[PDB]
């Protein structure tokens, strides 16, 4: 439940989700402010990429890398953050991509509290990756020890590709 | 106490501030996550422009117009929203408006709760304008009754001009 951000200590708030666990449901907002839950993606595997903010460089590169390198005819790549939906929509437009799913946890921190990734001091989500199988079993998890560092892309992408 | 946003009912949470009240303190974040409070603007008159999100068209236009039409000789124009600081930063840069003061209430809703402009159902700040004299007495207030409409720019600007 303890990480660092920019070198300073950060306490993670919420339920601890571990590999082998059943992944919890949640409620977030799409870019048009429709509510979205795990049920929208039933029957597919999911790479859930969690970032502090898509308007920062590391998070931007993480979102692009996972969306470029992971296949999407086999499953879903979700980006979840505390950015407002309006920032996420603008982000997709400015990147010139129309194939990228961004979801906002800003209103309730439903996702962050259910997955244990709320940086309590900042009201931002901790940099993390969760890989869910098509049965929403958590097959792979990383919470990045220092939030300004990149995640292990290759480990997460491999877990996702291999189901 | 109650407004509409897109015609839907919205309840305003927080302390009611009226003309002739003095301005409550607040704690918000500048674009580099440093804390800013009322004391940071001691000695100046203020036009405080509150928007739901600088990444929507109406809020964009409101921010541009208040900043271009108000004199910054003796006073300052503050934009406050629940946008993340990183969206505010990026917005100012993208617009060639790096000089514009944007402040984020996202973490604590300190400003929103102390000024009575939290749209409870959305966790966004309601479209609003407060004009403060150099003594921080509230000389002019508008909370826009339907939040997708523009504020009354002329009345706020006239109030600010004549302090």
Swiss-Prot record, chains A, B:
One of its GO terms (molecular function) is thioredoxin peroxidase activity. Residues 17-162 form the Thioredoxin domain. It is an enzyme of class 1 (oxidoreductase). Coiled coil: none annotated. Disulfide bonds join 59-92. InterPro entries: Redoxin, Thioredoxin-like_sf, Thioredoxin_domain, TPX, Tpx_CS, Tpx_Peroxidase_subfamily. Pfam families: Redoxin (PF08534). The active site is at 59 (cysteine sulfenic acid (-soh) intermediate). Its EC number is 1.11.1.24. Belongs to the peroxiredoxin family. Tpx subfamily. Homodimer. HAMAP family: Tpx. The active site is a conserved redox-active cysteine residue, the peroxidatic cysteine (C(P)), which makes the nucleophilic attack on the peroxide substrate. The peroxide oxidizes the C(P)-SH to cysteine sulfenic acid (C(P)-SOH), which then reacts with another cysteine residue, the resolving cysteine (C(R)), to form a disulfide bridge. The disulfide is subsequently reduced by an appropriate electron donor to complete the catalytic cycle. In this atypical 2-Cys peroxiredoxin, C(R) is present in the same subunit to form an intramolecular disulfide. PANTHER family: THIOL PEROXIDASE. This is Thiol peroxidase. It comes from Staphylococcus aureus (strain COL).
């Amino acid at each position: 439940t303890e990480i660092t951000f920019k070198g300073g200590p950060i306490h993670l708030k919420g339920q601890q989700i571990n590999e082998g666990d059943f992944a919890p449901d949640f409620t977030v907002l799409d870019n048009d402010l429709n509510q979205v839950t795990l049920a929208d993606y039933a029957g597919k595997k999911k790479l859930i990429s969690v970032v502090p903010s898509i308007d920062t460089g590391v998070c931007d590169q993480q979102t692009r890398k996972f969306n470029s390198d992971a296949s999407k005819e086999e499953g879903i790549v979700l980006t979840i953050s505390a950015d407002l939906p309006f920032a996420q929509k603008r982000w997709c437009a400015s990147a010139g991509l129309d194939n990228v799913i961004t979801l906002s946890d800003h209103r309730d921190l439903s996702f962050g509290e259910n997955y244990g990734v709320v940086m309590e001091e900042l009201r931002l989500l901790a940099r993390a990756v969760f890989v869910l199988d098509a049965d929403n079993k958590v097959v792979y998890k990383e919470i990045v020890s220092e939030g300004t560092d990149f995640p292990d892309f290759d480990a997460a992408l491999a877990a996702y590709k291999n189901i």
